[PDB]
Structure 1
Amino acid sequence: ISIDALMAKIKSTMMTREQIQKEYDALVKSSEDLLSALQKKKQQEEEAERLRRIQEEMEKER
């Protein structure tokens, strides 16, 4: 009766909460992947400029 309508409403609200959780999870994963790429890019750029300076200090002596 109003029990079965309310059971259906509880099931419908649980699905909405789960689907919204999944969309926010996908926003978080997307931003974290972009963050991971930028952190990697920063490590690579610092790595290269320190190594360039090591070669410049080696070429001054020769």
Structure 2
Amino acid sequence: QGPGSLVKVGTLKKRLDKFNEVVSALKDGKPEVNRQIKNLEISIDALMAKIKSTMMTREQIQKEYDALVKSSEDLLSALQKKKQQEEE
């Protein structure tokens, strides 16, 4: 038995940490970031526990991955406007 699809989930988790760093160097709009970044970290972690504690279909993981891509994508765009704004 092996991870298989879990690998993808872990990859995103890494992307999450990356956002934390970029956001850590911002110091602006922490509530909104830690809030979204939080539900996402939980989202990804949720799947993992679902992958080992349930026979989750790879298809379900693909879309869920998209759900993270949509929320994550918006986070970056939001961060950009944040840093460039230089004002909370």
Higher relative CO (CA 8 A, sep ≥ 6), structure 1 or 2?
A: 2
TM-score, normalisation: structure 1: 0.48
The two structures have a TM-score, normalised by structure 2, of 0.34
Larger Rg: 1
